[PDB]
């Protein structure tokens, strides 16, 4: 006799992400050598950590400029990978293809004023549950860092992952009126002749930043 | 030529087949085609009844054709083997039903060293006819060239071949000797006016089986 | 490697299942990310 | 290098002669057994079909390479689309045997029947040309025959192929300086 | 119970080049012996290396003849396996069944003039990117070899494989006006009473010549 | 999950000579003992070698009788398993079910005349390619044996297998006018008062006789 | 034995696949053929 | 050998899958190609 088998209902259809391979039809093909080619990347997050890309501010520019008002807010935006401010970054470009993330996101601030322009800035992370602070004094009670200008033109700060759940969504739901992950608040404490000077801002993935659950969600 | 004035040196070759010898002073060597020895001569198809007939292994001769200046590239002369033989080898074909043998072939085209042009001589299995384009690939077969500035003799040695271990020569000819004009003969002022092409051939390792009745 | 998850050996030889790579005579971004400065550039207080 | 051109001894120079370097080659695709081992379609007769590799058209890859050899040997696989049951008989069988189903007969099973068959000729090898009638090949040069109510497609596949004594293999004769054709390429 | 299996969609159809074998139906067949048959070949390139075959020149002849002009070009042709000059060779006959090649192709030149005819020839390989040379002086700057007549009637020269990619196509595309692999240029430097004498030309595969990717492309 | 399989097209149909076995349905059946039953045969050729059977001559008899003419031919027939003379033999009955054979066939001749009848006979094998001999003198040049009568009434002779191919066909084609395997020629050299006496003839398989390639070719 | 050619073990026990033979308490034609006289009965010359 | 690429053993015996070769009592073109002269015939300078 021969081996009996049960051809099972519910199994066998083609699945677009299945974990098996097709049967081959054309063998013994040897490829031209490509060992040691430059610039290889094997994990997209290595690129996201190593190459910070620009934020986008009002007017379509990657910087905020010194203000000469009583208003000390340089920028305030939703801590969301779907935020307009993050929309031209490599981080947001990658995040749209996953449904959840966890971990640290780093912001970099580079001063580009002349040698005789000085300034002192403050970045603060405001968690959800209360309206974001409008002044450096109210924001002082949040996790925050202050820095001034000098020989080193760049300052980098880690926005911490704080949430009730272990992961948060990369996308933003139409029902959520206020950002579920809080806000990033950038203030100018004061400046000395830095009127009109630009502070360029970039973002990169932190050491424990993680994206999970691939998803193809664009219609165009 | 790889040797040393007139036709010479290690270009002198003497071939002996039985009580017949042939010597040339402008040898370019011998081409062995497909093998340097015969495959098995005693298989199941003759039931151990085959025998060798050494008396047939000797040179016989025929004229092939006269190479003239008007012959152009592709002009060929074909000689199917075995051919008519009025000596001992020929009588074997009338005395035994099955036979096999290889061939030791010498083709000469004697003009002088002031002639130009070139002949290709080849031994081709199972060849009744060939197309013009195929002639460009005649070198796939055991061959040698005859180029007047270098030599007057071509020598090719081939074993018996065939779908059958022994043959019935009255109905099948396994080998065809072909001589083809590659570059036309030139005479100029001192060359020979034409070149007659001759073959000196010896059957080798002649085996026969299946004796026939006499006509008596 | 990749999105494959069978525990049993492929029925077909590697020579047929995929093209074969050759060598003549290396993850740049992984090295670049690993090399990142993670310290503090001046003096730290408290 | 120079050499005596009259001799058939092969001469194979290399780029090292002028300072180059010979590379490594991988010739698996020109291995005879590998290249002949693939199906090729022939146009079938309605019912009785003699299995004869000379039916493979001479311009096809298999047909041209087969004709580039004088003698050959191989086992065979055939794939056949047919109505009714398919019967095969070996080399030497009376044609009437094709109607008796004790001879290997494959009952119809959609969409086609594929079979492995052994070489069955009485000769040690077969030939693509035979200088008997000096076209026609002896009747014994075949792999048997098949028959079904209707045979609509027939493919041959040579297995364990062996070839002896190479013969001419010709490309297309072009009219212009180079034979040009449309090669597959990403669209407009 | 019995072993359950998933009969998978997308697998199982007959493939003309599949790597598996059919089920047998007629066993125990022993073949007549065929060991030691003469003339076996197991790789088509062994034949291509060992048996050079003739090139084809204007007029349908396998040779070029000495010229008595100021024009010293004996032949110039596209270095292509689809070239008319190579069209009757075993190499071209084989190449039409593969899409790519790499490596060395050898050309052989055999002088057939009488003892009192002498000549000096030059072969050069001109790469793509500039028009091929029309004179031996311009061609001298290319890779080339010169030789004269004497006791040995044959000279053999290797055409090198030089290309941007590791493989080149055996076929020639209708869009490529100038040959992508360059040209072979054969010149007569000079001759002494060799008017009308023929130089026969043949081609064979070199040691590293390689054909890959079988293809059946003829319609007839 | 479960084991995935490719149900392959072109495989699985019933084949009348397939090498596999059916599934069983009724087990544990023990047979009555049959060990040591007499007369077993396991290969049909053992029977063909050991049991010679009768040839058939003109008139439907298994013998030829002494002639008193100048004509010394007792019988001449095609060396074919399809010959009328062999048509009632076990050898021919077996051969019709195979397409090819090779090897030795033995003929046996038994004299049945009285004690005072003496004779001398000759058997010769004439190969294809020339017409068969009509006289003992012409046949002497073939492989042959002569024998006379005496105490032992039987003489046996092996017809050798001689052919271009390693196997010959058991059947005879409608296109073959003259027998492709030659002829068996039986002559009477002379006799002494054996007028009318019968020489009985039988045939058996020789030691290396072999039949191969089963075939079912009868329509009735 | 017979016209069977699978290399792998039958899925069913022998007790089910075939009837089972029993013994109580041998190829005659093979012995008969082997016993055949193949010599020469008298004296041989040359 | 050939265009075959399964790693697992054929289910049928060799005796059934293919015809069986026999021997009585060798790649000519491979030897011929290997024997090719690849040197230089006279003296070499520079």
UniProtKB/Swiss-Prot annotation, chain D:
Shown residues within the full chain: 725 to 934 of 2332
One further remark on this entry is: Contains the main antigenic determinants of the virion; therefore, changes in its sequence must be responsible for the high antigenic variability of the virus.
Query: What does the protein in this record do?
Result: Forms an icosahedral capsid of pseudo T=3 symmetry with capsid proteins VP2 and VP3. The capsid is composed of 60 copies of each capsid protein organized in the form of twelve pentamers and encloses the viral positive strand RNA genome. Mediates cell entry by attachment to an integrin receptor, usually host ITGAV/ITGB6, via a conserved arginine-glycine-aspartic acid (R-G-D) motif. In addition, targets host MAVS to suppress type I IFN pathway. Upon acidifcation in the endosome, dissociates into pentamers.
Q: Where is this region: Antigenic epitope?
A: 64-72
> Its quaternary structure?
Interacts (via R-G-D motif) with host ITGAV/ITGB6. Interacts with host MAVS; this interaction inhibits binding of host TRAF3 to MAVS, thereby suppressing interferon-mediated responses.
Name of the protein in its database record: Capsid protein VP1
Processing and modification events after translation: The disulfide bond between VP1 and VP2 occurs after release of virus from the host cell.
* Compartments, record wording: Virion; Host cytoplasm
Q: What is the lineage of its organism?
A: Viruses, Riboviria, Orthornavirae, Pisuviricota, Pisoniviricetes
């Amino acid at each position: 006799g021969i081996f009996p088998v049960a051809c099972s209902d519910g199994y066998g259809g083609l699945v677009t992400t299945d974990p098996k391979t097709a049967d081959p039809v054309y063998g013994k093909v040897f490829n031209p050598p490509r060992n040691q080619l430059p610039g290889r990347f094997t994990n997209l997050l290595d690129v996201a950590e190593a190459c910070p890309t620009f934020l986008r501010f009002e007017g379509g520019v990657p910087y905020v400029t010194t203000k000469t008002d009583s208003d000390r807010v340089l920028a305030q935006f939703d801590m969301s990978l779907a935020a307009k401010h993050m929309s031209n970054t490599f981080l947001a470009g990658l995040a749209q293809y996953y449904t959840q993330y966890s971990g640290t996101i780093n912001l970099h601030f580079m001063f580009t004023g002349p040698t005789d322009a000085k300034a002192r800035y403050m970045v603060a992370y405001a968690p959800p549950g209360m309206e974001p602070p409008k002044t450096p004094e109210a924001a002082a009670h949040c996790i925050h860092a202050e820095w001034d200008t000098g020989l080193n033109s760049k300052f980098t700060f880690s926005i911490p992952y704080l949430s009730a759940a272990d992961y948060t969504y990369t996308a933003s739901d139409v029902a959520e009126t206020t950002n579920v992950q809080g806000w990033v608040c950038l203030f100018q404490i004061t400046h000395g002749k830095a009127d009109g000077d630009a502070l360029v801002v970039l973002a990169s993935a932190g050491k424990d930043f993680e994206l999970r659950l691939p998803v193809d969600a664009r219609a165009e | 030529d790889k040797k040393t004035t007139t036709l010479l040196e290690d270009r002198i070759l003497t071939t002996r087949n039985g009580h017949t010898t042939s010597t040339t002073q402008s040898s370019v060597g011998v081409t062995y085609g497909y093998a340097t020895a015969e495959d098995f001569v005693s298989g199941p198809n003759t039931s151990g009844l085959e025998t060798r007939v050494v008396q047939a292994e000797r040179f016989f001769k025929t004229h092939l054709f006269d190479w003239v200046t008007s012959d152009s590239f592709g002009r060929c002369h074909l000689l199917e083997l075995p051919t008519d033989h009025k000596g001992v080898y020929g009588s074997l074909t009338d005395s035994y039903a099955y036979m096999r043998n290889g061939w030791d072939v010498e083709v000469t085209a004697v003009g002088n060293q002031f002639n130009g042009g070139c002949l290709l001589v080849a031994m081709v299995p199972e060849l009744c006819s060939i197309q013009k384009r195929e002639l460009y690939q005649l070198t796939l077969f055991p061959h040698q060239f005859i180029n007047p500035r270098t030599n007057m003799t071509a020598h090719i040695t081939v074993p018996f071949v065939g779908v059958n271990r022994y043959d019935q020569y009255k109905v099948h000819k396994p080998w065809t000797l072909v001589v083809m004009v590659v570059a036309p003969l030139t005479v100029n002022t001192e060359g020979a006016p034409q070149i007659k092409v001759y073959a000196n051939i010896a059957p080798t390792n002649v085996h026969v089986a299946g004796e026939f009745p006499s006509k008596e | 490697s990749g999105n494959t998850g069978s525990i049993i050996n492929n029925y077909y030889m590697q020579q047929y299942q995929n093209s074969m790579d050759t060598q003549l005579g290396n993850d740049w971004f992984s090295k670049l990310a690993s090399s990142a400065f993670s310290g503090l550039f001046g003096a730290l207080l408290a | 290098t120079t050499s005596a051109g009259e001799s058939a001894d092969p001469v194979t120079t290399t780029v090292e002669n002028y300072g180059g370097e010979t590379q490594i080659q991988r010739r698996q695709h020109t291995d005879v057994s590998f290249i002949m081992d693939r199906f090729v379609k022939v146009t079938p007769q309605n019912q009785i079909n003699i299995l004869d590799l000379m039916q493979v058209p001479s311009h096809t890859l298999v047909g041209a390479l087969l004709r580039a050899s004088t003698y050959y040997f191989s086992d065979l696989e055939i794939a056949v689309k047919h109505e009714g049951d398919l019967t095969w008989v070996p080399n030497g069988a009376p044609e009437k045997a094709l109607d008796n189903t004790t001879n290997p007969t494959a009952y119809h099973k959609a969409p086609l029947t594929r079979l492995a068959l052994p070489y069955t000729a009485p000769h040690r090898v077969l030939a693509t040309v035979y200088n008997g009638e000096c076209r026609t090949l002896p009747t014994s040069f075949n792999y048997g025959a098949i028959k079904a109510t209707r045979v609509t497609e027939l493919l041959y596949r040579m297995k364990r192929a062996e070839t002896y004594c190479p013969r001419p293999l010709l490309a297309i004769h072009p009219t212009e300086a180079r034979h040009k054709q449309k090669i597959v390429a990403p669209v407009k």
